[PDB]
Enzyme design. Structure first.
Site: not given
Ligand SMILES: CC(C)c1cc(-c2ccc3c(c2)[C@H](N)CO3)cc([C@H](O)Cn2ccc3cccc(C(=O)O)c32)c1
Length: 236
Positions: A44, A93, A160-162, A186, A188-189
């Site tokens: 993603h 993902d 159950k949380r989702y 941020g 993520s990944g």
């Molecule tokens: C609520 C909000 C602040 C928000 C939260 C998360 C998020 C991330 C990790 C995580 C959780 C939430 C859970 N708490 C458990 O771990 C992610 C996002 C991102 O806009 C998503 N995104 C979508 C496109 C794109 C392109 C590149 C990077 C990301 C990116 O994920 O950084 C991109 C936003």
């Protein structure tokens, strides 16, 4: 990372920062070194990325402020997104980045093992999520790499949380019942790394959740063990 603490140099040597260079240079996502030319990350992360030409992978980084115009990085030759991927919340993902050259391993950059063949039923009790992500909903990318220890939650409890989503065995969840520590935008990944018998394994890839560190809303990670055959086929 919400509720985390600052990491130190060499602590998470498989963690990389994936930057985009257009229209500005910024950190996009985390990733993990899993081989000498291979980064495992989240599909993603590549939303709106036209080609690998605009990416840079930086290894051996503690502080984002370390990155200057002379800091070495790896170009990305290829982005390999799982063929079933459409959106983080709908699974698959997972992506591989093939780098343009090989990573020479040192104390600050080295690979993390995948969950081992024979360890399908291991009970991981020492799991950590790391990254430069947000510490709250309206934040920015952080300078110092953060870490937080998070307990795994079973898939049956996570579902159950989702109740509005399909939590599958290709996902793994981790969180505290009362929240407070979690990954966020941020992160993520990047890895969910678990230490078992004094060896770190890449158990999850940070993927999604409902908010960040909310009570009864664990983080949802790609369950790496369920993609080992796919990873091996791509990296062989
Ligand atoms: C609520 C909000 C602040 C928000 C939260 C998360 C998020 C991330 C990790 C995580 C959780 C939430 C859970 N708490 C458990 O771990 C992610 C996002 C991102 O806009 C998503 N995104 C979508 C496109 C794109 C392109 C590149 C990077 C990301 C990116 O994920 O950084 C991109 C936003």
């Amino acid at each position: 990372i919400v509720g985390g603490t600052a990491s130190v140099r060499g602590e998470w040597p498989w963690q990389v920062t994936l930057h985009t260079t257009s229209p500005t240079q910024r950190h996009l996502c985390g990733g993990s070194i899993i081989g000498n030319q291979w980064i495992l990350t989240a599909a993603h992360c590549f939303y709106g990325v036209e080609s690998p030409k605009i990416l840079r992978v930086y290894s051996g980084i503690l502080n984002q402020s370390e990155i200057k115009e002379d800091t070495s990085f790896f170009g990305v030759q290829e982005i390999i997104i799982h063929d079933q991927y459409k959106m983080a919340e709908s699974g698959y993902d997972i992506a591989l980045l093939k780098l343009e050259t090989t990573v020479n391993y040192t104390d600050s950059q080295r690979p993390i093992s995948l969950p081992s063949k024979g360890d399908r039923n291991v009970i991981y009790t020492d799991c950590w999520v790391t990254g430069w992500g947000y510490r709250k909903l309206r934040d920015k990318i952080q300078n110092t790499l953060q870490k937080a220890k998070i307990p795994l939650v079973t898939n049956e409890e996570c579902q159950k949380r989702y109740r509005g989503h399909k939590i599958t065995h290709k996902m793994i969840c981790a969180g505290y019942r009362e929240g407070g520590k979690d990954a966020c935008k941020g992160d993520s990944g990047g890895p969910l790394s678990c230490k078992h018998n004094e060896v770190w394994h890449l158990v999850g890839i940070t993927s999604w959740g409902e908010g960040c560190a909310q009570r009864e809303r664990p983080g949802v990670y790609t369950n790496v063990v369920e993609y080992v055959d796919w990873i091996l086929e791509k990296t062989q």
